[PDB]
Amino acid sequence: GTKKGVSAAAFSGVTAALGDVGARWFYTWAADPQGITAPAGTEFVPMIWGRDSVTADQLQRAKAAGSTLLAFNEPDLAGQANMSVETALDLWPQLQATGMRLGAPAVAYGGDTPGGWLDRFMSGAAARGYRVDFIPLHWYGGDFSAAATGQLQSYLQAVYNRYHRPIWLTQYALTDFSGSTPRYPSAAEQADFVSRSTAMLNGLSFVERYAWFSLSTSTTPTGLYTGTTPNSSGVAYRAAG
């Protein structure tokens, strides 16, 4: 339906790639499309990335560029938004005051863990009477087998069962970051996971939207397209619902 989206950046060919792959929505990790011209039928979803992203200007730009707002990117990691739950909660009224459908900050991991970043954020928000409309998640699988899709499914289910909010999957791929250098699947393994994972996600009623990381090989080695040419993963993503 309207689930299948992507993360994107303004490479030459971006408008053509977005249209080619059938992306119904996209985001850029910023408050506006960052120089991307969307094709017809493709919705831009703004993001407030971190603490210093929360300004009158970014929030006004966000509301002009879209109608759904993603909050901070991986506050739980020192290399990303690097924000305590309490700082996220104290900033939340400024995002909530936009009136837009509002995503939780996207935690890198452990969204189902009692006492973890999300769990303390959701508990604090409930106690303050704040609105959290949906939960975006991130997941990178280290097992490159046919078992990967069921592992992804179990994490999304776990988060759904804990908070009972609709789920978005805003960054996902196969990548192992457990070693000193990232480890990536073979092309065939990655295309097979694209096919199985999208079929699962399309059938899971509490998943609203999903976004493969990422549209371009200029962003990441798990990219779907190089310029306007899909690889076997882009072809599989194109063929997904």
Ligand X SMILES: OC[C@H]1O[C@@H](O[C@@H]2[C@@H](O)[C@H](O[C@@H]3[C@@H](O)[C@H](O[C@@H]4[C@@H](O)[C@H](O[C@@H]5[C@@H](O)[C@H](O[C@@H]6[C@@H](O)[C@H](O)O[C@H](CO)[C@H]6O)O[C@H](CO)[C@H]5O)O[C@H](CO)[C@H]4O)O[C@H](CO)[C@H]3O)O[C@H](CO)[C@H]2O)[C@H](O)[C@@H](O)[C@@H]1O
Here's the x/- map for ligand X, 176-195, by CB under 6 A: it reads as -x------------------
Could you say which of 17, 89, 108, 167 contacts ligand X (CB under 6 A)? 108
* Nearest Cα residue to 102 out of 82, 76, 130, 126: 130
Here's the x/- map for ligand X, 127-146, by CB under 6 A: it reads as -----------xxx------
Gap between the Cα atoms of 237 and 241, Å rounded: 8
| Region binding ligand X by CB under 6 A among candidate stretches 17-25, 36-44, 48-56, 192-200 | 48-56
Q: Are 16 and 22 in contact (CB under 8 A)?
A: no
Gap between the Cα atoms of 158 and 154, Å rounded: 6
Place of tokens 């339906």: 1
Residue 86 or 143 having the CB closest to ligand X: 143
DSSP 26: E
Could you say which of 1, 40, 52, 205 contacts ligand X (CB under 6 A)? 52
| Region binding ligand X by CB under 6 A among candidate stretches 27-35, 118-126, 157-165, 221-229 | 27-35
Residue 167 or 239 having the CB closest to ligand X: 167
Here's the x/- map for ligand X, 76-105, by CB under 6 A: it reads as ----x-------------------------
Q: What is the 3-state secondary structure (H, E, C) of 116-174?
A: CHHHHHHHHHHHHCCCCCEEEEEEEECCCCCCHHHHHHHHHHHHHHHHCCCEEEEEEEE
Report how many residues bind ligand X under the rule CB under 6 A.
19
Size (the chain), residues:
241
Binding site for ligand X (CB under 6 A): 28-30, 34, 49-50, 52-53, 73-74, 80, 108-109, 138-140, 171, 177, 219
